[PDB]
Amino acid sequence: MKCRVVTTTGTADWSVRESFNNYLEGPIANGAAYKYHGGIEVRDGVETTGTKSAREFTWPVLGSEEGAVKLGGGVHWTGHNHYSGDDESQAPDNFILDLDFSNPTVKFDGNEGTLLVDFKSREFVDTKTVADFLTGTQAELATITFDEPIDLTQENVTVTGQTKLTATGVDVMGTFYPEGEALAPITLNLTNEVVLEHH
Ligand code: HEM
Ligand SMILES: [Ca+2]
Ligand SMILES: [Ca+2]
């Protein structure tokens, strides 16, 4: 028989949302109202440059399967720290806004797709509550429309998609965005090594 093996490498450029990074690193979430400040930490292969509205993230491609590009990496945002004592080891447990996205997956079919993410985010209850984390594994955070159909049999792919928050994503982001809210666009920078085997 004739078999096709596709090995996909590369990165995805996805800032999540510029105005969210601007707010989180700014004086509302991490200014003079709070004794302890948080910010943004990245891990597991994410690269980042800039701060606030200029911040960018690149996420490493782990590989592909039929209809999906699997990314690695994690980003953690923290703000609105509710703790004002003198024990700094308490601060990490007291950020009212405490959001983590990791291992995004881009599912696709032609020029449509879905952005899946592992998430851990405190629920927004009110401004005086450190609420319990909401969590999800490969949850649908956004829908995607690409500027061309995704074809992983092409060796070099650079394609950008617009993203819109899902109903699931509404609760992840504290209900501050409505369903359908635009998020940052996602660019896939892929190299697809296609090997045909008679085997
Ligand atoms: C003490 C608790 C909180 C306070 C006082 C607070 C305050 C604010 C304020 C005043 C804004 C509007 C800023 C602007 O429009 O320029 C805002 C925006 C926002 N907040 Fe928070 N917030 C809190 C908790 C949270 C939580 C837990 C989340 C969960 C992710 C969250 C997510 C957001 C988002 C997504 C926006 C929109 C940012 C944008 O414009 O892109 N907030 N918050
Ligand atoms: Ca070539
Ligand atoms: Ca292109």
UniProtKB/TrEMBL annotation:
Residue positions binding Ca(2+) 2: T158
Record-annotated Htaa domain positions: 10-188
Keywords from the named record: Calcium, Heme, Iron, Membrane, Metal-binding, Signal, Transmembrane, Transmembrane helix
Ligand binding (heme b): S19, Y23, Y177
Coiled coil: none
Binding, Ca(2+) 1: E155
GO biological process: SOS response
Source species, domain of life: Bacteria
GO molecular function, one term: metal ion binding
Protein name: Hypothetical membrane protein
Entire-sequence positions represented here: 35 to 228 of 319
